[PDB]
Design a protein around this ligand. Structure first.
Ligand code: HEC
Ligand code: HEC
Ligand code: HEC
Ligand code: FES
Ligand code: FES
Lengths: 292, 126, 34, 156, 212, 32, 30, 39, 31, 212, 156, 126, 292, 39, 30, 31, 34, 32
């Protein structure tokens, strides 16, 4: 969960650009994010994100049964960029957004937004109303091309903050040996205890929760760290990056005035060329050099 | 040589395991100042050997991807197994080793001279 | 966004031909203004 | 205009060595030099300043010698060589292929002298190799933006 | 006045020469590409020299100075952006120029040296690009340096020696930044300028290639 | 869209501005 | 990181240019 | 055919052309210069 | 969904590129 | 081989030209001074460029890097010392060259521009000297900058504007060091090189002055 | 050797404009160019490297923007101008005199054209002014190393 | 503006007079950061005005030569009397003034606007 | 005294290069110091100093009478350079030195030497045995051209460490007014009390010690700070600077070998020129081109 | 007069001269290069 | 600070050169 | 009183200067 | 030390003339070796 | 002194070395 991140990661982004949601959410699935090429100061533009996944398949739920997936995300914006306050968002836009309540990664990091968990059935595609800062007012924000880092996931994680696995990951042989017995646990406890007999004769027991399906039968031999189950996880995390240009109208205006100076000049040049070729053509006539 | 940390203030084997769980493989100051990883045995303890992150291919500091149980270089796709042995090229060699001895924290890195146990071949980083 | 580059790409091809064409367009006008 | 005088021995002589082509046609001055050049130079300035304003340069993050960006790419023009590298096993064989480019390029004029022609339509094999080579370079380049696993087919 | 000068420099000769030159009808618009490339190079020079009045080539203040140009220098953003965009354009235009030359056989005897010099220039240009991106000392430019600068160790014997020359020692540090700045703002220009002069001289001597 | 429009708009504009100065300079002021 | 717009421009001009060159070359061929 | 631009009609153009080119050239010039004046 | 000024800007630029070729083709009578 | 080249560059012409030149008997040993000066300039270039691989143009690390060259760089002491001594020599030799020229009237019509260009070069040279001494950022070089850089305020109106251009702001700081480095390692060379080219070209065109 | 042919109109023509002097005498190549030049260049290298080794460059003290060296002098070649400055009252009149130098120098060829001669012995006033000017420049220079009070007389 | 010291840590009128005797004229941080002298009245106390050391000639920081009772510039021989008034050129003007007010130490420099009492002429440094 | 310096100045040299002996010793008199152009490592060279003064004139002694002058000096050397130990100094040199006992400015600053007070009658010229350091051993010492700062004085000072004047300086009118009475003090106390009557009528008294001669009579009016006495001081302080090159024989050797390469080459060049001129001369003969 | 150096006697010199000049030129070359090899 | 050796060299060569120049000039004068 | 090597060094240098002129005067036959 | 520079100065004048002289000395020898 | 001596010594030496190679190259190997 994004809160997990918040609780265990001061900065959701690592030196190499990896987003922390990946320390636990071990699957990988494409994501999207699109924003305008550029935006004027103190304006509300929208970040459009996509966390595509096959809504047909079902994941292993917390308990042990199979259900629907939820989505969450972390959007990292440039200093100065923050969530547009409801009183700044156009009604029509508010529509595209839906009933989502984007939150600040922390009281300080208002430039980092998180959301979810929420029904990925309805929010596999989201819209985030954002408000560009204003160089005039705020100083530490100039007209530049800024990056935007997006993190997105749908599905349950593989590790908990404390480090222990979960019902949505793969389980491996705590050691090498022979499977002497795969015995189940209370009907209302779920899972099994895979008993593995080493070489010395010692028997170790590997607790496996409900969710993952065993893929080893009794009597077969196994290599340590070998998979005892399949990988139930059907969700996935995905990163993405992009940029946004905080524009200043004045620049494009000057650019336009400049263009006209150029265009003017270019025409005068070629017209002048043509004018003179008149002359050139004339003097190329023999009657110019001979009275006959 | 001694192994300093992020802010460059040496590592206390204890202080390190308070935050670094088991099976841990994160970077730190290593021999020659290069980024050298620090492993945490299954027995939530410091490993005898340290791995130098410098990819033997073209130079990129290789990251540990515990999801696939191995180091995978982001530059040209070099892959070294959990032990540091090159498993995928273009990298031709393995991540140089270094001895990691504890002394009541006071963790220090030692140069490796003996044969590379990961391939029986004598070390190239010597 | 691979569509974006392919788009941009195709766009340039477009712009180029349009330009040359309007070039001849002018040449033609000059010609007619003959 | 000014047609070439194939009567002149001076010219004929040059034509023989593959020269004198700048002695006939339209005057270069002021026709092109004084008039056209500026037009082209201004067009160029417009286009570049255009892009610069609309799409300014970005700052990265400061260098961190202890962390390599996960998605680290070279400049577009290196994309092909880059791909060759990640896709080729040997670390040397890869580098050689790299060097091959400029090396081989700087060969063309010599290993392509048997034929005295200029027009591509009178140079069959060359045309093919050029076209061929172009796809290969463009293909590899596009591939370098794909996952090593599928870059050599661009997922197709 | 013309008299004054012509009477001691012989402007005529120069003039008269410039006039004598003709442009044959097989000269497309594609033949403008070489010059566009040149135009880009000159732009780079001006635009580059300009940043020399603000940029600091040291690990401690490089990234900062670049930012300063982007935020405080008058049109600093416009200048850097131009240097950036125009560098990419120089390379692209160069490629197109090669295409033109190749598909007109303008490299066949003679002109072979014209092509050779060209390829060298191609290398210089590409070289400018690499050293350039290292200057702001950012994550990309840095690692780029690390990687490129490393490649040479693949050569037996001399290999390592070279890597150290390029990095001013073992590993990428200030020395690397220092040498790189020198290469970008002193050597590469000098070198490029030289070969560019040869390219031009030869081109002028042999005139454009023939028709078809 | 606005873009692909402003393009064709401005393009046409340029063509006019050109022809404008051309014809005006050729026939009106009779300088060309 | 990939420069989309730039790449677009490259992948666009490269072919349109090569094409034109073959076109003018053809015209002369006849 | 038509009339051949007399010297004068040619000097007029040169002047217009000069003045014209002065616009973009002066703009560039001034911006460039501006850059050098310390902030 | 960028502001208009911006889109006009791009367009303008796209025109400079294009019309430049135009002026050249015209000025040189072909190509 | 000569054939190969002569068949496409016309080495002959160049050769033949070089041979045709004669040296008239009124040419003393004093006529070697111009060239000695040039030799000194070239020495400065090589020797100067070399320090570009170690020197750091920032207030925080300049004095240090210079010292490093004096203490750690292979022959670093020999190089810097040469740059130092040879700079002084260039100026002195230049003076002697002027003496020669003046006392042979080699500046009288024509050649007047040859003299004018020369004086400009004289200024560039002297300019090299000043910007140079500021680089190590030591007490002398510093104050020297402060003083010289100030002189211009004596001009009405424009005065202050100029001082700020030379110092990159009010007062002598890093910006001053930065601009100065650019002037010393980029502009002055470029400029000097240009005028030096004119000096040479004209000299070659008009040949040495006459006898007596 | 090769004496000038005062019969040749070409030469006579040049001699008239003050040229052609490089068309007679001894061959420049290889005589001087190939043989002598190196000799001179090597001599120059020896002398400079000599001085460099025996008398290396010194480091100063780091710049201290809050303390100006008591004895602060410019480079030898500025000594004259420096002296003019400290010895002249006005801060402007001094600077003008300074600028005067290059300014006036760059004049010589023009304000000295009335006379068509070269040899100093056929140029009386010029010789005097040169000699004169030389003492003045050297004198002022030496003076700049003396105390302002006595610099204008060098204590004599 | 406040006037810092050598190590840039403000001046305590008291701390300063503990070491700086009477008739003292030594430098310190001044307005615009420039080196501004600090005088100690005959009454071993801080003077109301501070003197900016920047020689009005060509820029050299002028030193106080108590032996001759005046500031003498080492560059071209400019001489300003004990009050800061230019007495010898080439310097054309006097050392800019600045108000030096005390506030229980807590010494701060103030910009001078009123006429230059040393010559009755209005200030040029304004 | 040099000790005064030591006691009141951690560093005998100020930012602008002024030596502290001048804060009190207000007179100024030329001095000299000469050392070799260069010196090899771990060698004992000698610094030769001169503090010239007219030994005929006599100064105002501490008490009040007039006597001989004493000299002192401070020599500042590069880090690494220190006084040569007696067991390192050649006997002949020890001679030139005399019975002078040079001292370290402080236990750390062994590179700064002081001497005196001593009879300037005999030591107006001194010799200081110095031992160059060795780059090989000591690291922070390389083969460079180093400076040497010399401070030298002869005669009594004008100010004491506490700030009060002395019998060897000038005394001025503590205020403006009329001299109503110049009265002497005990024959064994010396000096006078110049009584000055201001304008308001107040009379102030100016104590003047023995030594300086009064130059004001009674009844005359004076301007504040005006001199009441002459300046007795007949001594003077002088600074000087110089350099020394710590040489490495190897460099000069290489330089020499290089020279021979050059000299060789130059000769071969001119000989070759001459050889070929033989040919040139031949072909210039008409008989070469015509059989006749 | 004397004998005029025959071609051969001229090639000999050129060789000596070459080898000779090689000394100082090689020295300079090597020192200069040495400078660039980082400490 | 003054550069004695350098100054020596300057003050030495300046005159010896000027002299030579007047000498050769004289020789030609005759 | 400098070491000998040093003085020889200076001398050597003084010779290079001098003999250079010599070689030049000889090689060029005058001046 | 003003003597030193004057000395150095005079020395150069000395060295210069000596050099030229030895030049002619050689020329003379060559001449004699005639 | 040593200096003003080594000068004249070395100078004379150079003169010898020169004349040496000259005469040896001219009369002995008869190449010049
Ligand atoms: C390990 C400390 C985690 C980090 C870091 C993040 N998540 Fe997580 N997440 C984790 C677990 C163990 C689970 C399963 C919860 C359970 O016990 O049942 C989850 C689950 C989610 C979900 C719910 C998915 C679903 O029910 O379909 C979402 C939407 C989610 N996590 C989002 C998310 C984001 C956006 C994160 C980075 C900001 C993130 N998680 C980090 C463990 C961990
Ligand atoms: C003021 C704090 C002083 C400093 C700093 C230095 N000297 Fe001094 N010196 C001072 C006084 C007041 C006197 C007179 C002593 C007396 O009370 O009778 C002196 C005297 C000397 C002398 C003796 C001269 C003589 O008797 O002829 C010498 C040789 C001397 N001082 C040397 C000297 C040196 C070398 C200094 C700097 C290292 C120095 N003094 C500093 C006061 C002060
Ligand atoms: C005061 C003017 C002046 C300056 C300054 C000057 N020159 Fe010259 N130079 C001349 C003139 C005049 C001639 C031609 C005299 C003649 O025709 O005989 C000349 C000729 C030359 C020559 C050819 C012959 C010769 O006399 O050596 C060279 C080489 C030369 N200069 C180099 C330089 C260099 C290098 C500089 C320094 C940057 C320089 N000059 C500065 C005026 C100047
Ligand atoms: S440097 Fe690691 S894969 Fe290339
Ligand atoms: S700057 Fe003070 S006298 Fe010149």
């Amino acid at each position: 969960y994004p809160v997990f991140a918040q609780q265990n990661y001061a900065n959701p982004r690592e030196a190499n650009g990896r987003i922390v949601c990946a320390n636990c959410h071990l699957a990988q699935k494409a994501v999207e994010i699109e924003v305008p090429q550029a935006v004027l100061p103190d304006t509300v533009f929208e970040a459009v994100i996509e966390l595509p996944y096959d809504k047909q398949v079902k994941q292993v739920l917390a308990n042990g049964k199979k259900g629907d997936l939820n989505v969450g995300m972390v959007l990292i914006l440039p200093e100065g960029f923050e969530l547009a306050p409801p009183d700044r968002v156009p009604a029509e836009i508010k529509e595209k957004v839906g009933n989502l309540y984007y939150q600040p990664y922390s009281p300080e990091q208002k430039n980092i937004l998180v959301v979810g968990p929420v029904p990925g059935k309805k929010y596999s595609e989201m819209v985030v109303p954002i408000l560009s800062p204003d160089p005039a007012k705020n100083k530490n924000v100039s007209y530049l091309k800024y990056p935007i880092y997006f993190g997105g996931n749908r599905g349950r994680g593989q590790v908990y903050p404390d480090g222990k696995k979960s019902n949505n990951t793969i389980y491996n042989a705590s050691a090498a040996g022979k499977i002497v017995a795969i015995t189940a646990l209370s009907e209302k406890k779920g899972g099994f205890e895979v008993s593995i007999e080493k070489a010395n004769g010692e028997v170790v027991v590997d607790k496996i929760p409900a969710g993952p399906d065993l893929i080893v039968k009794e009597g077969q031999t196994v290599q340590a760290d070998q998979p005892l189950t399949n990988n139930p996880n059907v969700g996935g995390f995905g990163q993405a990056e992009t940029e946004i240009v905080l524009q200043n109208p004045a620049r494009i205006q000057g650019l336009l005035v400049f263009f006209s100076f150029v265009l003017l000049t270019q025409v005068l040049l070629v017209l002048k060329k043509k004018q003179f070729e008149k002359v050139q053509l004339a003097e190329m006539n023999f009657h110019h050099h001979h009275h006959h | 040589q001694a192994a300093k940390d992020a802010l460059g203030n040496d590592i206390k084997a204890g202080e390190w395991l308070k935050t670094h769980l088991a099976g841990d493989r994160s970077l730190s100051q290593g021999l020659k100042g290069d980024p050298t990883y620090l492993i945490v045995t299954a027995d939530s303890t410091i490993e005898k050997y340290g791995l130098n992150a410098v990819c033997t291919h073209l130079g990129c500091v290789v990251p540990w991807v515990a999801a696939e149980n191995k180091f995978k270089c982001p530059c040209h796709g070099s892959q070294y197994n959990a032990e540091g042995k090159v498993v995928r090229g273009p990298a031709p060699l393995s991540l140089a080793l270094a001895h990691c001895d504890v002394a009541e924290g006071l963790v220090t890195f030692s140069t490796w001279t003996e044969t590379d146990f990961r391939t029986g071949l004598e070390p190239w980083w010597a | 966004e691979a569509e974006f580059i392919a788009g941009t790409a195709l766009t340039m091809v477009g712009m180029t031909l349009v330009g040359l064409a309007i070039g001849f367009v002018l040449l033609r006008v000059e010609s007619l203004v003959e | 205009t000014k047609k070439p005088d194939l009567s002149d021995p001076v010219l004929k002589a040059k034509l023989a060595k593959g020269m004198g082509h700048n002695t006939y046609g339209e005057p270069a001055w002021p026709n092109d030099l004084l008039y056209m050049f500026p037009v082209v130079i201004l067009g160029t300035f417009a286009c570049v300043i255009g892009l610069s304003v609309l799409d300014p340069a970005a700052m990265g993050e400061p260098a961190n010698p202890f962390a390599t960006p996960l998605e680290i790419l070279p400049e577009w023009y290196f994309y092909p060589v880059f791909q060759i590298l990640r896709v080729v096993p040997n670390k040397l064989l890869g580098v050689l292929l790299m060097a091959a480019v400029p090396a081989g390029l700087i060969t063309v004029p010599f290993i392509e002298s048997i034929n005295k022609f200029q027009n591509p339509y009178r140079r069959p094999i060359a045309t093919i190799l050029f076209l061929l080579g172009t796809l290969v370079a463009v293909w590899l380049g596009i591939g370098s933006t794909f996952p090593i696993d599928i870059s050599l087919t661009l997922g197709l | 006045v013309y008299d004054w000068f012509e009477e001691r420099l012989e402007i005529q000769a120069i003039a008269d020469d410039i006039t004598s030159k003709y442009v044959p009808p097989h000269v497309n618009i594609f033949y403008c590409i070489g010059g566009i490339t040149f135009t880009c190079f000159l732009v780079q020079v001006a635009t580059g020299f300009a940043m020399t009045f603000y940029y600091r080539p040291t690990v401690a203040e490089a990234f900062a100075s670049v930012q300063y140009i982007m935020t405080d220098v008058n049109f600093g953003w416009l200048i850097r952006s131009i240097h950036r965009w125009s560098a990419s354009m120089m390379v692209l235009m160069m490629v197109l120029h090669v295409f033109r030359v190749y598909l007109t056989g303008g490299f066949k005897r003679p002109r072979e040296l014209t092509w050779v010099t060209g390829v060298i220039m191609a290398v210089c240009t590409v070289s400018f690009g690499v050293t350039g991106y290292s200057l702001p000392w950012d994550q990309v430019g840095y690692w780029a340096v690390k990687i490129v600068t490393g490649v040479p160790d693949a050569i037996p014997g001399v290999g390592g020696f070279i890597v150290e020359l390029l990095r001013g020692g073992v590993g990428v540090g200030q020395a690397t930044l220092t040498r790189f700045y020198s290469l970008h703002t002193f050597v590469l220009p000098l070198l490029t300028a030289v070969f560019m002069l040869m390219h031009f001289l030869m081109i002028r001597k042999q005139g454009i290639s023939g028709p078809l | 869209m606005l873009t692909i429009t402003s393009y064709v708009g401005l393009l046409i504009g340029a063509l006019v501005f050109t022809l404008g100065i051309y014809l005006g300079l050729l026939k009106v002021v009779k300088l060309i | 990181m990939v420069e989309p717009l730039l790449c677009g421009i490259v992948l666009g001009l490269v072919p349109v240019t090569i094409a034109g060159l073959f076109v003018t070359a053809y015209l002369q061929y006849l | 055919s038509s009339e051949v631009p007399d010297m004068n009609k040619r000097n007029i153009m040169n002047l217009i052309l000069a003045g014209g080119a002065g616009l973009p050239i002066t703009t560039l010039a001034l911006g460039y210069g501006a850059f050098f004046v310390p902030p | 969904g960028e502001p208009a000024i911006v889109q006009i800007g791009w367009a303008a630029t796209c025109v400079m590129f294009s019309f430049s070729l135009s002026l050249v083709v015209w000025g040189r009578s072909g190509l």
